[PDB]
């Protein structure tokens, strides 16, 4: 049958200041045609806690086979304690499993700030949780996209619309084994 992949994300999945149909998860939905449905449930600015709050209703509504979790970056951009982001993501993963869905956890990393300690503590939560839950750990695309000015909005922070087909094709390759 035609299964649903739910994306629980922030602007990296929603697409910042663009139509939903322009964002890579919609392009991926188009690529996959009727073989697999992609539901983008991503909102710019969401923290992991905000994604957690939205998740139960989405699980009930969409009954997805897999949930790609792409969250925590805002927590880290705001200097939130990594243990709290870890715990929130842990709860997300528990909820997804208890809904009989398979979680897929995207690694997130932060831009430079001061020293390496905070950023390393933040990035470490993702392989830890993927091992703990024994779930797929998907690679993070944002640093590579940021190397292409032609793929970035004027802020140098958010990918633009032209980035999205490239991200879609890359994510398709990463998700094909599903
Ligand atoms: C650098 C960590 C990844 C940031 C993604 C979240 C951006 C946003 O939703 O506005």
Distance (angstroms) between ligand 1 centre and the Cα of 47 equals 9
CA atoms within 13 A on the CB side of 111: 12
User: Does 11 sit in the ligand 1 pocket, CB within 6 Å?
Assistant: yes
Entry resolution in angstroms?
1.2
Method by which this entry was solved? X-ray
Nearest CA to 44 out of 1, 79, 73 is that of 73
Strands (DSSP E) contained in the chain are: 3-9, 36-40, 66-70, 102-106, 137-138
Tokens found for residue 61 = 């509504």
CA distance 37 to 26: 9
Annotated catalytic residue 11: yes
H runs (alpha helix) in the chain = 11-14, 24-32, 48-62, 73-77, 82-98, 117-133, 142-146, 163-175
Distance (angstroms) between ligand 1 centre and the Cα of 51 equals 13
Distance (angstroms) between ligand 1 centre and the Cα of 1 equals 34
CA distance 159 to 177: 26
Which CATH architecture fits 1-178?
3-Layer(aba) Sandwich (3.40)
Q: Where are the domains of the chain?
A: 1-178
From 74, 111, 145, give the residue whose CB has the most ligand 1 atoms within 8 Å, as the site to mutate. 74
């Amino acid at each position: 049958g035609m299964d649903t992949l739910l994306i629980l994300g922030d602007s990296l999945s929603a697409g910042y200041r663009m139509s939903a149909s322009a964002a890579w998860p919609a392009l991926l939905n188009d690529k996959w045609q009727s073989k697999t449905s992609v539901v983008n449930a991503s909102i710019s600015g969401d923290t992991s806690q905000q994604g957690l709050a939205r998740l139960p209703a989405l699980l009930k509504q969409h009954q997805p086979r897999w949930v790609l979790v792409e969250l925590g970056g805002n927590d880290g951009l705001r200097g939130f304690q990594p243990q709290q982001t870890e715990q929130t993501l842990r709860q997300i993963l528990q909820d997804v499993k208890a809904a009989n869905a398979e979680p897929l956890l995207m690694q997130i990393r932060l831009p430079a700030n001061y020293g390496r300690r905070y950023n390393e503590a933040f990035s470490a939560i993702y392989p830890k949780l993927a091992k703990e839950f024994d779930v797929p750990l998907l690679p993070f695309f944002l640093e590579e996209v940021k190397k292409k000015p032609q793929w970035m909005q004027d802020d140098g922070i958010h990918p633009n619309r032209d980035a999205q087909p490239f991200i879609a094709d890359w994510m398709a390759k990463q998700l094909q084994p599903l």
